[PDB]
Amino acid sequence: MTADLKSLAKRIYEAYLKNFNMNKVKARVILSGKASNNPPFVIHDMETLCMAEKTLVAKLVANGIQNKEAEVRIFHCCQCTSVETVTELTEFAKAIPGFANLDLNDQVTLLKYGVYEAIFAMLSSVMNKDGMLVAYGNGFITREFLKSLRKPFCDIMEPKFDFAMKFNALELDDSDISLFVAAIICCGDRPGLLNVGHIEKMQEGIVHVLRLHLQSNHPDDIFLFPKLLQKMADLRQLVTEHAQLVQIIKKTESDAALHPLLQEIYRDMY
C-alpha cells in the first residue's frame, strides 16, 4: 500500500463525499438515533404516505400525479432520486484516474450499465431490515408497506432489501464503498465498448486499490475482496432483473411513465 494508493483512495473517497449528499455515516447515525431525538417521519401505511406527500403537493400536481394511484406516485418520485444519483454518479466518475481521457461514447457506455449497479450498491447504506431512509434521511419508508403495495410494484424494492441485508453484513464504510462504486463503473465487460484496452488498464488500477484498501481496512475479513467481487456479479444480475421488471411495468401500467434520461439508460441494455 504505497503512498500513491492511499492518495488515490482518499481522492476517490473525497469525490464520493462531495458528490453524494447521503453517505453511510450520516444514515447510520440517523438510523441509530444517538445524535438527535427527532426521528425521521415514518411512512408505514397509505395515510402516513399522504401526510408526507403534503410537503411536495406542488410537485405532485405539476407532474399530473396527485390523483393517480399511490403505487404510481411513489415510483414516480423514486425516478427523480434515480436521475439525481445518475447525475451525482456522472460527476463522481470524473475522479477515476484516466476516465475523462476515454472516448465520450465509452464514458456513456460505462455509465449506462454501471449507474444502477452503483445505485443499488449505495442504496444499501440507507437500508435496514425494516425500511430505508428517504428525502436525505428526513423520512423512513417501511419494508412492509412497500410489500403491501399491489403487484407488480411490491416486487420492485423487496429484491433490493434482500441484497442490502447480506451486503451490509460485510460492514463496509464510506472508504470501502467509494472504491467499490468506482470499480463498478470501470467494468471492461460492458457490451459496446470501443477501446476495450484503455478501460481494462483503468480497471486493474482501481481494482488494485480496492483490494489493498480492503486488506488494510478490514484485515480480519481475509476474503472480503473476493466476496465484493461476487457482490458485483450479484449486482449485475440484480440490475438485469430490475430492467426486466421496469419493462413489464412500462407496458402493463398506463399511469406509469418512464423518465426520458432513464429510458435511454434502459434502452437496448439487456
Ligand X SMILES: *c1ccc([N+](=O)[O-])cc1C(=O)Nc1ccccc1
Binding site for ligand X (CB under 6 A): 43, 52-53, 55-56, 59-60, 63, 65, 74, 76-81, 123, 126, 134-136, 139, 141, 257, 259
Helices (H), 186-223: 196-217
* 244: helix, strand or coil: helix
Neighbours of 182 (CB within 10 A): 30
Whichever of 9 and 65 has its CB closer to ligand X, that residue is: 65
Whichever of 56 and 232 has its CB closer to ligand X, that residue is: 56
Whichever of 76 and 213 has its CB closer to ligand X, that residue is: 76
Q: Residue 16, annotated ligand binder?
A: no
Rounded to a whole number of angstroms, the minimum distance from the CB of residue 16 to ligand X is 16
Looking at the DSSP assignment, which residues form a beta bridge with residue 43? 141
Q: Count of alpha carbons within 13 Å of 151, Cβ hemisphere only?
A: 1
* 111: helix, strand or coil: helix
Rounded to a whole number of angstroms, the minimum distance from the CB of residue 133 to ligand X is 7
Rounded to a whole number of angstroms, the minimum distance from the CB of residue 226 to ligand X is 28
Rounded to a whole number of angstroms, the minimum distance from the CB of residue 145 to ligand X is 10
Q: Residue 266, annotated ligand binder?
A: yes
Contacts of 149 (CB under 8 A, 6+ apart): 70, 71, 74
Q: Residue 270, annotated ligand binder?
A: no
Least Cα distance to 114 among 2, 18, 203 occurs for 203
DSSP state letter for 103: -
Cell of 57: 403537493
How far is residue 249 from each of residues 41, 63, 80, 181, measured CA to CA in Å? 29, 19, 17, 28
Whichever of 43 and 199 has its CB closer to ligand X, that residue is: 43
Rounded to a whole number of angstroms, the minimum distance from the CB of residue 236 to ligand X is 20
139-161 per-residue burial string, b: 16 or more CB within 10 A, e: under 16 = bbbbbebbeebeeebeebbeebb
Whichever of 125 and 203 has its CB closer to ligand X, that residue is: 125
Residue list, annotated binding site for indeglitazar: 82, 116, 266
